[PDB]
Point group: D2
Chain length 362, copies 4
């Protein structure tokens, strides 16, 4: 049974006294339950957000043009283009939980030192030689690099070359706004440290596999790894595929290599509200259909193939971004070898025990 076909027993006699009680409800800020239980409590998630794809060539065109018409600054903070879900009523929200944005930084430009409670990351698909300084620690950016900017950490963005750089912001702005959890402070209009060191202190303490500095024995809520570089991400994915060739367990599913970016102090997610993963599918691979609670977003990093969402196949190229709202059945099909970057609100669904998963063949 469901909400579209269950017997509605309460439906009250439309008398003067009834309408007067309803007038009374309006006055006293009361809304009766009966007239809407179903809206409030669906059979399964039925998101206001809608599955949607953004074409990279489109995003690029509008990003370059923004580069012409407007400087990056101080009220607006970033020349960034936020992907707004058609189903979310004009809000700059790619899902109810996440903001997803393309930030363009033109030659020699800078962004200034700020912090907010909202958790953030920067993912670079094309570009080079911009540097984000986090809590004073300059973190070089380049193709394939995930940089983190966990909540309440100072950060600003200096471009060291005559080249523009395009990256994606991901944040829990939509969660943080709706739940009243936001704080924000100012730092400097120049980035705090103009130095351009090829690797960051955080990297240099923390990017040694299976090793922990004795000066860093305390666990952290977010990750101290300022950058997860393309190289390591690439090699991990390749080994998983080589291991598969060799008949050893590694891949998540046949032909489907994948890793999660993690906080090394805990082995858990990079930040309290956001999970990041990277996936490499072999040419020909088609993932089982999944329904998962919460929203995820992917960007095609390399290769060619397709998503299916609610049964609708959309063809996908390098750079394209799509969102799968809560519970929408989704799968991915690689034409060539298909490299994809992923973020979701899953750590929220998981901390609060709201997660569920339906997979096709089980």
């Amino acid at each position: 049974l469901d909400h579209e076909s269950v017997t509605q027993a309460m439906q009250p006699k439309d008398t003067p006294e009834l309408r007067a009680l309803y007038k009374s409800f309006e006055e006293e800020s009361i809304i009766p339950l009966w007239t809407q239980l179903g809206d409030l409590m669906p059979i399964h998630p039925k998101s206001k957000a809608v599955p949607h794809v953004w074409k990279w060539s489109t995003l690029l065109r509008l990003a370059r043009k923004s580069g012409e018409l407007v400087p990056v600054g101080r009220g607006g903070e970033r020349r960034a283009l936020g992907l707004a879900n058609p189903g979310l009523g004009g809000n700059a929200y790619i899902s109810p939980t996440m903001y997803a944005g393309i930030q363009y930084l033109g030659p020699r430009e800078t962004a200034p030192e700020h912090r907010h409670s909202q958790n953030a990351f920067r993912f670079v698909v094309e570009g080079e030689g911009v540097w984000t300084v986090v809590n004073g620690d300059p973190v070089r950016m380049s193709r394939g690099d995930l940089l983190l900017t966990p909540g309440w950490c100072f950060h600003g963005h200096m471009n060291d070359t005559d080249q523009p750089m395009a990256w994606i912001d991901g944040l829990d702005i939509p969660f943080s706004q709706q739940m009243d959890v936001g704080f924000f402070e100012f730092g400097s209009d120049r980035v705090t440290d103009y130095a351009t060191p090829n690797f960051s202190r955080g990297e240099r303490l923390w990017c040694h596999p299976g090793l922990r500095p004795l000066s860093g024995l305390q666990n952290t809520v977010a990750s101290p790894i300022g950058a997860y570089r393309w190289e390591f991400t690439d090699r991990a994915l390749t080994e998983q595929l080589l291991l598969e060739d060799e008949g050893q367990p590694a891949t998540v599913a046949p032909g489907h290599a994948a890793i999660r970016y993690v906080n090394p102090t805990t082995g858990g997610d990079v930040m309290p509200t956001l999970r990041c993963e990277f996936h490499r599918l072999r040419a020909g691979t088609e993932t089982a259909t999944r329904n998962e609670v919460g929203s995820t977003v992917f960007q095609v990093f390399e290769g060619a193939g397709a998503v299916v969402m609610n049964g609708e196949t959309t063809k996908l190229e390098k750079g394209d971004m799509f969102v799968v709202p809560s519970w929408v059945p989704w799968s991915l099909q690689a034409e060539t070898q298909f490299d994809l970057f992923r973020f979701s609100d899953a750590p929220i669904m998981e901390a609060l025990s709201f997660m569920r998963t339906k997979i096709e063949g089980q």
Copy 2:
């Protein structure tokens, strides 16, 4: 500095080419960051919900009248009156995270066996001899009793007497709706077990202080205590006040006794999304002003006194309910001995490391 007075550097020249790019934004579901950073990222939480009080005598009048005009049933599920925040745009939400409701159950009436992912509790200020059956386990209800109804547990409500009963629902419906996390199923139109045992199985395994059944060694995400009875709550609060008389640490603050309802398997909160507490202030007590992230709601259980919210003192009687949205400075003043029941979304703010606290004298 803040968002009302920082220099806005980006403000682009209003040319034809600019307006064309903006037209282009609308078409492609893009919203640029610059025109609204401040809305998105405030200096501190600035909730859409508003501090509000509901007068019990008012809620009672409208609840009784609902008892006349409408039966409790099957589409509408409950004859319950939801406290809607004036600041939340018509939604039946007392805060962005919580639903708060007054449910009236008339003589001999029943509610039927359902379950949903949404977490729930039932708190009885006046009434007797209704019974909620949880996963088949009948749980008697009476003045002062917190009953839990954790997510995904079957539940229905049979009234064993010619008396009406009034209680409050509290749920994370507003969280669960906005985050797309809701599921819902049907059970029976009679409650599953008409038996009326004076205490429930859960109570009888789990309400022995400092003792755990060896058949219940596994930890749970929600509490197995079906009911936290007035008696124990009352005695705890009294002892804390006696201990204070005796010069021993106990009270949270001078004259301010208080306890948190807990999951005994973990010592943590009753449910993943909701904290419940009970407070007893001595006559004359005035709490330090607090700002806390997330929303809380209180109901005056006994006595007389006042709240101050944003500096506005409101006088309060037995049964009244008020909400303090995220970050609104609040304090409480007891005229007589002031007993109050409390719920909040704090376990969410805390799991996700979003919590902060400003207290007056420190």
Copy 3:
């Protein structure tokens, strides 16, 4: 295969040069592996301690006589009689991990305020009106009461009546000695607070089922419950048996009711090194045979029946105590209703992932 029948390939030619190398080993503090792998690394635990029973009437006789011949004091600290395992080479160790002792306190006598790192508890089978003061907090003692005395907490013992009292100490002295973990300090020769309050502060904050004081929100490594009283222990066990009569899950095994004493801040064990449980078997009940890693000890609190250890049935009366060393197969058989108190080193085996369990019918 095993160590008694595997081929020994290394066995070196007994030449002058070999004996010279062995002489050399002795000199340099070297012991070669080859000559003893099997001693060092058995097929399954093969404890030096031996299953043993102590007859209460025996312990009582020797305790009273100790009462005549010797006062309780200041070097010797306690007039206590420690159960020494025949297999543990003269040490006052009931198992390799635990000390088990019967302490006699005669009329009007006191013990003085000390503390040590070693974790301790006091369990009273017969007696009344002695009081242990813990960190200044007087904790009354009587038949059935478990008192805790966690490591590094000051404690002393005043007897308020013309009656002697007999209880059992349990401690991790044998663990703490062998692992070099012991510290010890002095407090007073009178107990710190001669007052005799019928319940202790700790009880009065913490013994309210499912409730936590807001002044005690921090988790603890040991339990803040100073006393787990007979009443609650008794009622818990009875309810589990009533629930069984009623066809509801409760008992661990058919006719076998049981509870674990717990730290309410965590739901975990009372102390880092020691687990305490209480068991009530129905007349006729015979438990499945178990092998568990680590040692346990039981005292018959009420009733009559038997243990089987390595196949040897021993008949048991009120007060008797037996130990089951690591991995010895054991079971219990109730003739009448059989009440038993239990402690083990299981939290150690469990924290370090050394635990295993073999049960007969599975």
Copy 4:
């Protein structure tokens, strides 16, 4: 005050009746507390084990000679030379908790596939081209490499060259024997997989910094990293020293670089009972004196310098090994740059809340 000078009040009158009660004690396996509280409960740890150094050139000489006189085999399992503490009564125990051993494996020799509950690691100071197969996964060994062999994992050792190899075993045999926690099984006399792959599967899934395979989302009690290679260990230590040159936090103490080997699924220790660290001191560095609960052991990997234990300076060269029993004050002084490998029983002291630390300048 202490146990050498506190008043001994109990000392009973030596009468016939007293001696008869004592005779009675012996018969009934009772040992009275009074006559020995102080032995049992010292003021601070006073270990039976003694600070001791083993000279590498000595260990090497006896290891080579063992290579002549005896083959590695099947009863004796390993041609390994265990460092026995003079203070531990003939047992092959370097401390009460740990076994420390030097294993010699001659040309073309193998060890066979076994497993035991006891946790183990292999650390190579000099040697190359031996391979330990763990649960079928061949793990190459070379200078500076820590290999893990967590409890209950099959393992055997094949030497692929005409060269001998010398390494150290470290195990919790002494803990496991004394606490009755040991199990042991047989596998094959050839290692299971003669293949010699330059890196192991475990490495290849798990040695990518800040990355986790989605096929390995479950946490583990021991580490899945089969090998922590010299390279990464070396670079980590160097960066910490470069960071210090650059005025950035990194080192534990001035001139004192250091890392802990960790389980990447948790950020915690490599195994439940054993901590491993590596330290690199700058020439001239002298560490503050420490007292720590539990025993540690170090091996000088490179450089030259000294330890001080109970005030006794001993000079130290490449390969030397020393043990610091529980609570012995210790410090380290580098003459040249001083590289050292370290293991301890600290995870035990820490899980059970027995740890304490006294440091000189605080």
